[PDB]
Chains A and B, each alone.
Chain A
Amino acid sequence: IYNGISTSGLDLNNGTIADMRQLGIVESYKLKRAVVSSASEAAEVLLRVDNIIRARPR
């Protein structure tokens, strides 16, 4: 996939790299943007906190 003309993908049936366009393996585009946008904001919350005070044990 480094340079060009790469249709290859992860094939778990044969345990090797195969073309996903022939097998018909697709994933939703809305799921792609939702995970990346949520994981990006999730990492910002933990990094922007320099000191974490121990919470009160219940």
Chain B
Amino acid sequence: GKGQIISNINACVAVQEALKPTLGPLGSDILIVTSNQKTTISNDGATILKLLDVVHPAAKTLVDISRAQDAEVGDGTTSVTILAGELMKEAKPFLEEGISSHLIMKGYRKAVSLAVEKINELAVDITSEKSSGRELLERCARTAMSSKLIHNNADFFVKMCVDAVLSLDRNDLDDKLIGIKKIPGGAMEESLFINGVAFKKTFSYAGFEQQPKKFNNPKILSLNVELELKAEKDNAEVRVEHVEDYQAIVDAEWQLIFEKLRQVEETGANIVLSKLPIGDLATQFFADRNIFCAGRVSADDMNRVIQAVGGSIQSTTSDIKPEHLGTCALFEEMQIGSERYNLFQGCPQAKTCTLLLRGGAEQVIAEVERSLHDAIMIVKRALQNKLIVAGGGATEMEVSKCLRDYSKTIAGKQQMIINAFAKALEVIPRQLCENAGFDAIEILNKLRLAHSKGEKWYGVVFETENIGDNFAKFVWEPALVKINALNSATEATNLILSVDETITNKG
């Protein structure tokens, strides 16, 4: 019946209400408690919404469009869910007066055809004009770091952010290629950029391992299985018919491993890593040969080492071929972070890097880790996509303007629908002001003054509350966000409003 349509609209409001404070870098965060009891807190709407698992069928549409938003684009997963839900809230009083849903849903796609042609007119392609290679990455890095605790220390952080993307291919860039590990303790300005990978220092036990950490050209080799003798967990029982034979029972592993001890010496590999915990048998012979090794290496850490020197993993140490080996330029393990952490430097073939951060608490670094990801996604989409538009409410306020004038020239019921479509676009700049504390009543009223003077670049200043231009604030967003969001929000809005019945089978 008709009552199912209204019930489906209010069901999405409860999900949308939680995603409203998550819009913007300064907005509130959602605390989600998984059934596994692991607590995760982040401002990225993708991972957030994926943890809800709402039983309601129409709420699954928001999850489906969130995956395509994070895959094809990666930015704006929160805004695409709020914009798709806002159109359903404004259409609630229109359905109570007898207006069919088909006319309202059809009117939304009418403004989409005018929105696609509007984005192409607002897209300006500029690369080397009034800019350079270093000035492009430097000016855009301080924008995402503004209004944060790192703004005073951002001078040293921008220099490390520019060299991060230069170490990787400009045609193909991935934000996951730069790792960030939380290191408790130390100053936040003492962090450095490393091309290699670091470990967690999981060994708190003392009494061995003397060795200098300064190496010239170590050789890297991967080992798929654990080679060890001493084991802290399990144990071996020996019962036989002879008294003097109790010793030799546990020695069955000697000969074949005894030969493998000198195979590394003949090979010369100075780096040995494995995804399984390694005992003290491997660390024994490696001392004199100046061979470095680390046990209990994560699975994701070895995959980054394979792509570093171009080597490959092998099960045993016998049949390893010479092309599996690799060598870096320098290996230096310093005390940065008040603990010795191994790292690689000088790998020309390395397809990934790691950006280390320091701070007095792990929660402070977590706020910086999510803030650095926003600056990477801007550069990630500024390379492949040459169309750059003014974001932060600039383009959002421009789309609503022109659509109000196009409705006056369109006779019929589409006039109120397009006018309501442009009116619902005001939720994006509003919520951004409420999350930062600014008053959305006065700004949205005063912004419409200069907005009608013909200048389409007027944005919203995120630092000090006032009307201004995002061109001077260096707030940029790719044109792919505005194109993919309007197409996904319109399809998701027309899908839920057309539901006349909710069928759920139990058993």
- A adjacent to B, CB under 8 Å: no
